[PDB]
Amino acid sequence: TATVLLEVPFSARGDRIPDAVAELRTREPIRKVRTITGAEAWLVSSYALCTQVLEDRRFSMKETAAAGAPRLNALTVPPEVVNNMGNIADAGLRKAVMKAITPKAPGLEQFLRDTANSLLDNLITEGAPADLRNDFADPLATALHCKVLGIPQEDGPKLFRSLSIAFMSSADPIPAAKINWDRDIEYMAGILENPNITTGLMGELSRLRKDPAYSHVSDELFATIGVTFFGAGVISTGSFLTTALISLIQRPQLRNLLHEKPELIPAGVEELLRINLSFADGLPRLATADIQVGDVLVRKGELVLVLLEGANFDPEHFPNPGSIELDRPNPTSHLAFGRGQHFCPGSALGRRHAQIGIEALLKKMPGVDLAVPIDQLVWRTRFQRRIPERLPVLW
Ligand code: HEC
Ligand SMILES: c1ccc2c(CCc3ccncn3)c[nH]c2c1
Ligand SMILES: [Cl-]
């Protein structure tokens, strides 16, 4: 009997990789799929072909936003925002933005530790079960990014609540996304004019905005940087830490090891990054030329989806890919942060967020365990991240 073209994404579950991924990688590591919009795309699932695509700018991020292109999903932002990093670079702002979002600012790591410990103390006081997503990982991400941006902690929750819509992976445009986007842009425009905001990313952007060397950079770009980096950083660190905590809880031997030897936590987090399923969709690129990828000649104008867990569970690059092994020879060579032109600018901050969050959790609740059977986690659908709606634990 006839079947439709293979549809992506395969599963919204972030606690297991579908067997279909390895079968695809082995039989057809670049293969045609249908996205939720109905568009066809090339799904790339081997490490070698994923890196090839991400390292060839002729597979363009920016052009995925072009009118009439085959789409993975509907834009939730103005099309120029897809090229936000490119616009930042063209405005002469890349170095300043990068420096503002490193975890090395004085007191930043102590802020993370203090915040994590305070959130955990509150959970211990409230008593089990505790929701490690809504009452730990996401508030820690939100507090971190208010600090990094230089904006008041009390503004975090409202900005955060845009994100369950802003990072939707939808077949169609989302009216609420524009409502929240325009509102959050207005907020950050006000931040740039707010004399109290003198630290962090927005403090620096506010200064550069009045510097004659940036007098022709648009106010829209300055505001957009704030919304984009808050949203990307918070959704990415919150979702990654949440699904990392699941992987850690499901490995009590690793939890005990990292609890007893915290110096191993960075290597543990690198492996948790490698096996992380937080990205719900392949990374999209639009071909701007005819390009050979494996056995397929990708044609100009076609959509390519780089499946991160395809690369990161590829046994030809990461032997025994499903196992967390702290002594791999190539531990940071995973694609959790992408690769090439669009490699994540917040990679160092995301690493520190997770390392400190896990260190604090293991000290405060060494006996942490799921409080529900793992299958009972509710996996958010049609979203750019895989996350459980609640993460109930006991300890
Ligand atoms: C505070 C900012 C920030 C943080 C923190 C952050 N991201 Fe990023 N990330 C970005 C931005 C902005 C981009 C777009 C870069 C570009 O287009 O050049 C990006 C790009 C990426 C990409 C590549 C996307 C592509 O299409 O090539 C991946 C993958 C990624 N981030 C994953 C993560 C993960 C995983 C984490 C946490 C563990 C994280 N990011 C934390 C802001 C952030
Ligand atoms: C693929 C998907 C999304 C993006 C973005 C914007 C991400 C964002 C930020 C805040 N609210 C909503 N979305 C920039 N480059 C991208 C590539
Ligand atoms: Cl504050």
Numbering used by the authors: 2 to 396
Paper text:
The utility of this method is illustrated by way of an XP Screen against CYP121A1, a cytochrome P450 enzyme from Mycobacterium tuberculosis (Mtb) championed as a validated drug discovery target. CYP121A1 (mycocyclosin synthase; EC 1.14.19.70; Rv2276), functioning downstream of the cyclo(l-tyrosyl-l-tyrosyl) (cYY) synthase (EC 2.3.2.21; Rv2275), catalyzes the conversion in Mtb of the cyclic dipeptide cYY into the highly strained biaryl-containing natural product mycocyclosin. Whilst the precise function of mycocyclosin remains unknown, ablation of CYP121A1 expression via genetic knockouts showed the enzyme to be essential for the viability of the bacterium in vitro; CYP121A1 is thus seen as an important target for anti-TB drug research. The CYP121A1 binding pocket has been shown by X-ray crystallography to accommodate ligands in three distinct regions (i) binding to the heme group, (ii) binding in the cYY region and (iii) binding at the top of the binding pocket.
Compounds 4–37 were screened crystallographically against CYP121A1 using soaking experiments. A number of hits (7, 10, 14, 21, 31 and 33) were identified, although the completeness of the electron density for the ligands was variable. All six of the X-ray crystallographic hits were ligands containing 7 as an integral subunit of molecular structure. X-ray crystal structures of compounds 10 and 21 with CYP121A1, whilst of better quality, still suffered from incomplete ligand electron density, either lacking complete density for the indole moiety (for 10) or lacking density for the central linker (for 21). Hydrogenation of 11 over palladium on carbon in ethanol in the presence of triethylamine yielded the known pyrimidine 10. Most compounds gave inconclusive results as a result of aggregation, due to limited ligand solubility in the aqueous buffer. Compounds with lower cLogP proved to be less problematic, with both 10 (an X-ray hit) and 55 (the 5-hydroxy derivative of the key X-ray hit 14) also showing evidence of activity (protein melting temperature shifts of +3.5 °C and +0.5 °C respectively).
